[PDB]
Amino acid sequence: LKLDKENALDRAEQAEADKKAAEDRSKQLEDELVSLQKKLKGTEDELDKYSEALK
Amino acid sequence: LKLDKENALDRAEQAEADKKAAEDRSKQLEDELVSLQKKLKGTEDELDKYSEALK
């Protein structure tokens, strides 16, 4: 207990460092997902440009 | 005190829970970078199908 505030604070720093790494990945992956979505839509809208040009 | 460890632990435990959540977000986003990349390529493959059908 007595040193657990410290062990848990350091654990929290590490757990936060890891939730942060996971969260930073979430943000980076969020940026990539969005980039892929913009590119997907680039290609989906393009899919329609060709589909429409095709019909 | 037990309360200092409990609070630091709540920070650590919640940070671990947040790591789970952050990891869930980042692993889901990675799965969705795959779904977006896959769907991007779904659309890219289809762009060629329409582009080719178009040409």
Author numbering:
A (entry chain Q), B (entry chain P): 11 to 65
Excerpt from the paper describing this PDB structure:
The thin filament consists of actin, tropomyosin (Tm), and troponin (Tn) in 7:1:1 stoichiometry, and Tn is composed of three subunits: troponin C (TnC), the Ca2+-binding regulatory subunit; troponin I (TnI), the inhibitory subunit; and troponin T (TnT), the Tm-binding subunit. Tm is a long α-helical coiled-coil protein that binds over seven actin subunits on one of the two long-pitch helical strand of actin filament and forms head-to-tail connections with adjacent Tm molecules to produce a continuous helical strand along actin filament. Upon Ca2+ release from the SR, however, Ca2+ binding to TnC causes conformational changes of Tn and a shift in the azimuthal position of Tm on actin filament to allow actin–myosin interactions. Here we have determined the structure of the entire thin filament from human cardiac muscle in the absence and presence of Ca2+ by fully utilizing the recent technical advances in cryoEM and image analysis.
We also carried out cryoEM structural analysis of the thin filament in the Ca2+ bound state, obtained a 3D reconstruction at 4.8 Å resolution, built an atomic model and compared it with that of the Ca2+ free state. The overall structures of the entire Tn complexes in a pair are similar to those of the Ca2+ free state, showing the same conformational difference between the pair in the TnTN linker region connecting the Tn core and the long N-terminal α-helix of TnTN, except that the density of the C-terminal region of TnI above the Tn core is missing in the Ca2+ bound state. The Tn core in the Ca2+ bound state shows a marked change in the orientation by its counter clockwise rotation of about 30° in the horizontal plain with a slight swing up of its distal tip of the IT arm, the major part of Tn core formed by an N-terminal region of TnI (residues 41–136) and a C-terminal region of TnT (residues 199–272). Even around and within the Tn core, TnCN and the short N-terminal α-helix of TnT changes its position and orientation relative to the rest of the Tn core. Most of all, the Tn core shows a large change in its position and orientation together with the azimuthal shift of Tm relative to actin filament, forming more intimate interactions with actin subunits. As expected from previous observations revealed by EM structural analysis using the helical symmetry of actin filament, the position of the long coiled coil of Tm is shifted azimuthally along the surface of actin filament by about 10 Å. The azimuthal shift around the head-to-tail junction is markedly smaller than the other part near and above the Tn core where the shift distance is close to what has been shown in the previous studies by EM helical image analysis of various types of the thin filaments. This is likely due to TnTN binding to Tm in this region and its N-terminal side also binding to actin filament, restraining the Tm shift.
